[PDB]
Amino acid sequence: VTDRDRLRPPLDERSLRDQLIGAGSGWRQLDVVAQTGSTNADLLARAASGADIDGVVLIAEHQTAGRGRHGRGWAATARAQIILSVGVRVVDVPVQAWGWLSLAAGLAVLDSVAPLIAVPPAETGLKWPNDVLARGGKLAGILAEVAQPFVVLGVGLNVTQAPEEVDPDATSLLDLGVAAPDRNRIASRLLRELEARIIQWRNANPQLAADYRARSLTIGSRVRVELPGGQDVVGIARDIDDQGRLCLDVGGRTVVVSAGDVVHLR
Numbered sequence: 001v002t003d004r005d006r007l008r009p010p011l012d013e014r015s016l017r018d019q020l021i022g023a024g025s026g027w028r029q030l031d032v033v034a035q036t037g038s039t040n041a042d043l044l045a046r047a048a049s050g051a052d053i054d055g056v057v058l059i060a061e062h063q064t065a066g067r068g069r070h071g072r073g074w075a076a077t078a079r080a081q082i083i084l085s086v087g088v089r090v091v092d093v094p095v096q097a098w099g100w101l102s103l104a105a106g107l108a109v110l111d112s113v114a115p116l117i118a119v120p121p122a123e124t125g126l127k128w129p130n131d132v133l134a135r136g137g138k139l140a141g142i143l144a145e146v147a148q149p150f151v152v153l154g155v156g157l158n159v160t161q162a163p164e165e166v167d168p169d170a171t172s173l174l175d176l177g178v179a180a181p182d183r184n185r186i187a188s189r190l191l192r193e194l195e196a197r198i199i200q201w202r203n204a205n206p207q208l209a210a211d212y213r214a215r216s217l218t219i220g221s222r223v224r225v226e227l228p229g230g231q232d233v234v235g236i237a238r239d240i241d242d243q244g245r246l247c248l249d250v251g252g253r254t255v256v257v258s259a260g261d262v263v264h265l266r
């Protein structure tokens with residue numbers, strides 16, 4: 001609404017650079033753009049033209065042609081979200097492990113905003129693959145895309161974004177009770193958490209998988225999983241495997257899902 005605009009000051013690119021680029025940090029470049037079609041598309045394009053995008057950060061105040069998984073979209077209004085993409089060199093890591101990079105990103109986003117909530121409402125955590133949920137609503141969405149030797153990780157985090165503006169199943173920090181969320185502080189914490197999780201992923205650190213399981217809303221829940229191609233499978237999510245795939249219990253039979261949309265059931 002018009003009133004939420006007063007809760008949406010611009011990002012401070014100068015300050016973010018000061019905090020996030022320098023000794024002790026792996027981020028090599030940070031830019032804030034007023035507007036773009038898709039931050040993911042932009043970093044993919046840079047890589048396609050020969051740019052080294054490892055440790056490169058692109059943040060957009062507004063995104064007009066946002067991309068979701070499986071060809072879906074991502075909606076946004078100006079300054080209502082933290083909208084960013086980062087580049088990650090992955091060629092040094094076995095391809096079977098790349099799926100965990102996306103899971104690590106969701107964990108980073110969750111950890112960056114979790115303390116901002118006074119009372120953690122029911123169902124606050126990670127829905128497989130890496131939706132960030134709070135009170136059943138989708139607080140953030142992550143998209144990982146390949147451009148050898150890189151992966152581009154994209155984060156869309158609803159800070160003051162109203163559900164009526166983007167999606168009926170959406171939520172935001174503001175709609176979770178955070179009266180005056182500071183995107184500058186949140187973006188800084190997010191990128192610091194993200195660096196740590198990427199390093200963990202790159203070194204196959206056991207704590208990454210352990211920390212993910214600890215925050216998983218999906219593991220242990222009855223789910224309907226919509227597979228690519230339109231088929232549904234119903235069962236109980238039991239675990240995540242070493243490729244980041246979802247292990248389903250279907251009446252005693254194990255079904256491993258590499259990609260799909262999860263609906264938590266009663």
Ligand SMILES: Nc1ncnc2c1ncn2[C@@H]1O[C@H](COS(=O)(=O)NC(=O)CCCC[C@@H]2SC[C@@H]3NC(=O)N[C@@H]32)[C@@H](O)[C@@H]1F
Nearest residue numbers: 038040066067068069075141142143154155156166167170
């Ligand atoms: N702002 C929003 N908040 C919550 N849910 C939203 C939303 N905008 C759209 N949605 C809903 O979520 C669906 C898409 O969800 S999804 O298939 O799991 N995909 C994702 O969650 C990944 C989204 C990644 C968006 C980031 S923002 C910066 C980066 N660049 C880019 O183009 N994409 C990534 C849409 O079909 C539906 F509209």
